[PDB]
Design a protein around this motif. Sequence first.
Motif, PDB file in Angstrom:
ATOM      1  N   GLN A  94       0.833  -1.201   0.000  1.00  0.00           N
ATOM      2  CA  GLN A  94       0.000   0.000   0.000  1.00  0.00           C
ATOM      3  C   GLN A  94       0.865   1.247   0.000  1.00  0.00           C
ATOM      4  OE1 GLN A  94      -2.235  -1.331   3.630  1.00  0.00           O
ATOM      5  NE2 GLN A  94      -3.958  -0.321   2.606  1.00  0.00           N
ATOM      6  N   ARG A 143      -1.895   0.319  -4.661  1.00  0.00           N
ATOM      7  CA  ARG A 143      -2.033  -0.953  -3.970  1.00  0.00           C
ATOM      8  C   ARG A 143      -1.468  -2.057  -4.837  1.00  0.00           C
ATOM      9  NH1 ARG A 143      -6.974   1.503  -2.885  1.00  0.00           N
ATOM     10  NH2 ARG A 143      -7.869   1.480  -0.768  1.00  0.00           N
ATOM     11  N   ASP A 145      -9.857  -2.037  -1.770  1.00  0.00           N
ATOM     12  CA  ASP A 145      -8.976  -2.612  -0.764  1.00  0.00           C
ATOM     13  C   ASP A 145      -8.602  -4.066  -1.052  1.00  0.00           C
ATOM     14  OD1 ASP A 145      -8.675  -0.402   1.306  1.00  0.00           O
ATOM     15  OD2 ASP A 145     -10.865  -0.526   1.220  1.00  0.00           O
ATOM     16  N   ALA A 179      -5.178  -4.915  -1.798  1.00  0.00           N
ATOM     17  CA  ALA A 179      -4.219  -4.968  -0.703  1.00  0.00           C
ATOM     18  C   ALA A 179      -4.541  -6.066   0.312  1.00  0.00           C
ATOM     19  CB  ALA A 179      -4.152  -3.620   0.003  1.00  0.00           C
ATOM     20  N   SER A 201      -4.279  -9.079  -5.982  1.00  0.00           N
ATOM     21  CA  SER A 201      -3.159  -8.146  -6.013  1.00  0.00           C
ATOM     22  C   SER A 201      -2.265  -8.428  -7.222  1.00  0.00           C
ATOM     23  CB  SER A 201      -2.358  -8.245  -4.707  1.00  0.00           C
ATOM     24  OG  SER A 201      -1.621  -7.054  -4.466  1.00  0.00           O
TER      25      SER A 201
END
Length: 242
Positions: free
Chosen positions: A88, A114, A141, A144, A150
């Motif tokens: 992050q 991220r 989010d 992350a 990711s």
Amino acid sequence: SVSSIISHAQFDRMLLHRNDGACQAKGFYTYDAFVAAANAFPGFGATGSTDARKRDVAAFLAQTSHETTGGWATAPDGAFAWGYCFKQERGAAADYCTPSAQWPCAPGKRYYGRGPIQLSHNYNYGPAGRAIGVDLLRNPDLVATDPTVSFKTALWFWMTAQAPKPSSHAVITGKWSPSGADRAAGRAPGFGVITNIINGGLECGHGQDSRVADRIGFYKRYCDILGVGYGDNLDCYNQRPF
Ligand SMILES: CC(=O)N[C@@H]1[C@@H](O)[C@H](O[C@@H]2O[C@H](CO)[C@@H](O[C@@H]3O[C@H](CO)[C@@H](O[C@@H]4O[C@H](CO)[C@@H](O)[C@H](O)[C@H]4NC(C)=O)[C@H](O)[C@H]3NC(C)=O)[C@H](O)[C@H]2NC(C)=O)[C@@H](CO)O[C@H]1O
Ligand SMILES: [Zn+2]
Ligand SMILES: [Zn+2]
Ligand SMILES: [Zn+2]
Ligand SMILES: [Zn+2]
């Protein structure tokens, strides 16, 4: 299948200290997540000669390592052994939300960096999410908190062209055909043009640059581990930015 190019052993040797206590993302990035993410982008590490495939993997891990590095001059095993230390954007960051009816920002969410490529802005979380079948505009989010998601966002960036910028993948696997404008700008195929693609406006075309050198350091170390030559034109010191 990318496992045929890079083993779990090699992966951990490359991203050696990512799980050290000083690393924010310790425990997050796993080889299994990398491999799972790679399955969604079949061409990655499976296009071109065996050497091109090795470089495709080494270059991807090198550029993403730079974006998430925890390295420093006096770091154990050198600065190039500290990629993937973060997941992050450090600090207070920002909203990174710009008006867009195509990729509208979700109330209260922020699109700061991220993951491996430090994906940023709603207009990038939007297409990246669509590419992997996940609503990243509403749940940014996840980039992350889910290591597979990711890695997938980073591979999406690696495999996606931004014409006239080719995809980084196309360049490294030798599938890019430079235009007359590219030849005039000194943009010849190699790791250097990939740096240019990623952040050339700020790093390329102005002589030696420590950020470019860091990217190259990671790339050479990773190529050495996979046992492949680096190829030509590693820097972008004399390349006009895109
Ligand atoms: C003198 C001494 O020994 N000091 C040691 C410290 O240096 C060392 O901490 C490490 O310090 C370096 C900087 O010196 C730091 O590197 C920075 O890392 C961030 C995070 O990855 C990078 O930020 C990214 O920048 C790119 C491009 O701008 C962005 O696109 C991206 O979004 C950013 N990523 C994130 C997640 O924000 C910086 O670019 C990078 N700076 C440089 C110059 O390379 C390391 O992260 C520090 N390492 C750690 C583990 O914190 C410390 C280690 O314990 O030891 C001190 O002694
Ligand atoms: Zn492992
Ligand atoms: Zn360690
Ligand atoms: Zn912005
Ligand atoms: Zn400049």
